[PDB]
Amino acid sequence: MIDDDGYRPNVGIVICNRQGQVMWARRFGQHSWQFPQGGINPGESAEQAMYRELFEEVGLSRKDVRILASTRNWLRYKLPKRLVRWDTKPVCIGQKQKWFLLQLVSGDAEINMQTSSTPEFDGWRWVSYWYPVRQVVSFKRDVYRRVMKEFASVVMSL
Amino acid sequence: MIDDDGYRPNVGIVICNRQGQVMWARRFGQHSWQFPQGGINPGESAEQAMYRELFEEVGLSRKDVRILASTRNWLRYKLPKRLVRWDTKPVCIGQKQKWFLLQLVSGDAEINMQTSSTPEFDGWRWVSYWYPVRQVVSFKRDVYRRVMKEFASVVMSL
Amino acid sequence: SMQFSKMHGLGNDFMVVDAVTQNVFFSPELIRRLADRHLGVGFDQLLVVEPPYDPELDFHYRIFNADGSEVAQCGNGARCFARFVRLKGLTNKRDIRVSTANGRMVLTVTDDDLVRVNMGEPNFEPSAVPFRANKAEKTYIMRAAEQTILCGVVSMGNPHCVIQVDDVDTAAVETLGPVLESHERFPERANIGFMQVVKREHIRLRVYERGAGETQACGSGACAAVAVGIQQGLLAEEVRVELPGGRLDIAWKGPGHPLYMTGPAVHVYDGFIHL
Amino acid sequence: SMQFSKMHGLGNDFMVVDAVTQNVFFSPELIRRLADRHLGVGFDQLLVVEPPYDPELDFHYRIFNADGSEVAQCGNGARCFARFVRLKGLTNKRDIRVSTANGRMVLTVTDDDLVRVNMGEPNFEPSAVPFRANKAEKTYIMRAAEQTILCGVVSMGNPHCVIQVDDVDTAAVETLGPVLESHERFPERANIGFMQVVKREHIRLRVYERGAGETQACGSGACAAVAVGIQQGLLAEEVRVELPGGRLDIAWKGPGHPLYMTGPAVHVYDGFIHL
Ligand SMILES: [Cl-]
Ligand SMILES: [Cl-]
Ligand SMILES: [Cl-]
Ligand SMILES: [Cl-]
Ligand SMILES: [Cl-]
Ligand SMILES: [Cl-]
């Protein structure tokens, strides 16, 4: 599932509302927060796997969200050394991501924090626009910067 | 022969040498100077008409010159009002040009200043690189700037 | 390896740096090299814009002076920040909730493209200036060499001593300002303001700033002069202030109310530097 | 509507503008607005690079001071020009033939990325400085208040009076420089140089410049001090000069030969401005 450079393909999702906030999710068990991001199975389309983890970890069918923009390219980040598993090969060094931006055209109630018996997230809340760039783990941070940048103009439309 | 905006298609030519100079030509009769530029007939290729006026006003067959780069796009300039002929329609307002840069792989002797009985140029000389941007007529000047700019890197190769 | 913007508010020039969409690091030494006017970019202060540190606010920002150290002044660099984040399309709001080394705050862009800045409510208690005196009074007596001066003292977070004068052009700022700044009754020194009242709604103003001398615009200075002018019955509630480098509009409705300061901010050029 | 580059040579900061690949216009008023250090870009001089005005040379260039007016000094802004046109890839030559408000010239970039500048041959004839004296001499006597000063006078195109001193740190520049600049025997005034000779190949130097006071680097000043030092038997033919803002290497082989001055030029940042 890894490519030749070590990166495994993933999709990230940034759900916003008309008021200009985005949805910030608490990771399961812990009290660390981050955006939804999930693995693209073999033979998945980018958009496919996106809607996949959207439903699994949010409980949102395509009727509830309106696609607003994806990124042009794949964005890469490298895990730090202490979290690299060198012995399980091929060795995953980091992730290459494609990010999509949705608008919630439904209500703040179909947000099923745990649909499956395997909930990767406890709760959620709404946050201002540039808040995640500070809060996300340090190695994720450049990716988040580029993402929120490319998305910011589009989100600044009412 | 004009397009819908008034511009008529033309090619400009900038012949240089290894020493990094370009060829500056005296217009016929007068003592004003400029680069070679000529009209693209119906059904002419850009490169075609180029080699055309290269031979007609220089006397240079394709064996004597080596193509180095053309421009990516068409560059437009607008004649001033006092030189516009409003009564001959469709009215030519200016020119849209494609510029080619050659290297003289032959000698400074096949430069036949007048091959045809209709010589548009008296003599010629070699000049430093950015000299024409000053000397050319004022309305041509922006075109020359963009041209010499795009060409300058390529010419700065020995 | 960095994009910046040079701006100024009424002659107070900032280097302004987006640390929101940029990874960026600093030194005291680096900031000094950058602030130098012939060797670097040239600025009085460096203003860094950062993501908010809580989900309700919009941005956070820091200020370093050209010595290298952080500056926590209440209204410092607020209007340049406020026009910047709109100019660089980082927000499209007119009200902006911001956090600084002084706390939360809210900033409003007006239709004229000016910024209104809530400065807080002016503290007149002497012990808070600090100003050495027996009770808080509307006017005090400065025994300065052979002259006797009628001061009014306020804190905008800075210390200020405001003096009424008859024509600001005729005032002896360069001689009296230094002796009033390093006065006994000002253990932390003070900012000296010379205020000529033209109408209940219009004054002129010159300020001899702490350790620096006369400046062409002190924001807190204007705030102080209008506060003390209102507290002394001289001024109305919305005073236009003329400073050597332009105009401020101060509004304050007395004790119990904050003081609102309104001014321009100018964007001068966009620049890119390595290191 | 314009791209510029801010540079400095030994603390002499220029705004540098490519007028070769750019259409660009100026005012005295505009240049003043741009030169202002808090309201504009901030610079001591604006340097404009233009296409050559004859087919044999490479470029032409002009200099405007921050008052707004053109400057014709022999070595002024030469090294910043010379590193600029290479940096912005407008030429790849190491020898560059250039024309200014002073005439033709040739500039050499060295392997160290320094620029060698031919300044012409120093004129010692008094009537050309102008310097009021009975015959050209290697040393003259300045009767200045109670002191007596041994000067040497040269023209690099500027007027210069060079004074030997024992330690440049110990010299009273700020007091004596003004009185020597506006001296009777200097109807056009003069640039005052204080020169401490360390070895036949190494001096230190401070310069009180005309109408400006002490500067951290005067190029023609260094040239003058080394010329007069050589003409007085004090110095060898290749002198290192230490100025408050860095180092120059002057070489001059006596009368009949030009004087070559070699220094750094620093590129500081790239900027874009509207108007
Ligand atoms: Cl992973
Ligand atoms: Cl035509
Ligand atoms: Cl708030
Ligand atoms: Cl508030
Ligand atoms: Cl020459
Ligand atoms: Cl020469």
Side-chain angles (χ1 to χ4, degrees), chain A residues 8 79 92 94-95:
Chain A
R8 57 181 321 156
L79 258 48
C92 162
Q95 298 193 23

PDB file of all heavy atoms in Angstrom, chain A residues 8 79 92 94-95, ligand 1:
ATOM      1  N   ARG A   8       2.185   6.714   2.535  1.00  0.00           N
ATOM      2  CA  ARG A   8       0.951   5.991   2.255  1.00  0.00           C
ATOM      3  C   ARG A   8      -0.183   6.978   1.992  1.00  0.00           C
ATOM      4  O   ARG A   8      -0.260   8.020   2.658  1.00  0.00           O
ATOM      5  CB  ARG A   8       0.563   5.053   3.411  1.00  0.00           C
ATOM      6  CG  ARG A   8       0.407   5.723   4.780  1.00  0.00           C
ATOM      7  CD  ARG A   8       0.043   4.696   5.849  1.00  0.00           C
ATOM      8  NE  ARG A   8      -0.888   3.694   5.341  1.00  0.00           N
ATOM      9  CZ  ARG A   8      -1.020   2.475   5.858  1.00  0.00           C
ATOM     10  NH1 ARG A   8      -0.260   2.109   6.886  1.00  0.00           N
ATOM     11  NH2 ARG A   8      -1.885   1.608   5.337  1.00  0.00           N
ATOM     12  N   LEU A  79       6.824  11.308   9.413  1.00  0.00           N
ATOM     13  CA  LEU A  79       6.775  11.024  10.833  1.00  0.00           C
ATOM     14  C   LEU A  79       8.155  11.256  11.450  1.00  0.00           C
ATOM     15  O   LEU A  79       9.179  11.148  10.767  1.00  0.00           O
ATOM     16  CB  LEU A  79       6.308   9.584  11.063  1.00  0.00           C
ATOM     17  CG  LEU A  79       4.854   9.324  11.492  1.00  0.00           C
ATOM     18  CD1 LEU A  79       3.829  10.074  10.632  1.00  0.00           C
ATOM     19  CD2 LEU A  79       4.569   7.830  11.466  1.00  0.00           C
ATOM     20  N   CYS A  92       6.670   2.441   6.441  1.00  0.00           N
ATOM     21  CA  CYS A  92       5.949   3.695   6.236  1.00  0.00           C
ATOM     22  C   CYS A  92       6.719   4.835   6.908  1.00  0.00           C
ATOM     23  O   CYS A  92       6.913   4.825   8.126  1.00  0.00           O
ATOM     24  CB  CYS A  92       4.526   3.575   6.793  1.00  0.00           C
ATOM     25  SG  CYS A  92       3.616   5.117   7.100  1.00  0.00           S
ATOM     26  N   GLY A  94       5.957   8.295   6.144  1.00  0.00           N
ATOM     27  CA  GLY A  94       5.038   9.381   6.391  1.00  0.00           C
ATOM     28  C   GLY A  94       3.747   9.173   5.638  1.00  0.00           C
ATOM     29  O   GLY A  94       3.365   8.027   5.366  1.00  0.00           O
ATOM     30  N   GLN A  95       3.080  10.279   5.289  1.00  0.00           N
ATOM     31  CA  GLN A  95       1.816  10.245   4.568  1.00  0.00           C
ATOM     32  C   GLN A  95       1.825  11.269   3.445  1.00  0.00           C
ATOM     33  O   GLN A  95       2.410  12.349   3.586  1.00  0.00           O
ATOM     34  CB  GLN A  95       0.633  10.498   5.515  1.00  0.00           C
ATOM     35  CG  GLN A  95       0.489   9.438   6.603  1.00  0.00           C
ATOM     36  CD  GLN A  95      -0.840   9.503   7.340  1.00  0.00           C
ATOM     37  OE1 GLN A  95      -1.828  10.031   6.829  1.00  0.00           O
ATOM     38  NE2 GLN A  95      -0.872   8.933   8.541  1.00  0.00           N
TER      39      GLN A  95
HETATM   40 CL    CL E   1       1.005   6.892   9.178  1.00  0.00          CL
END
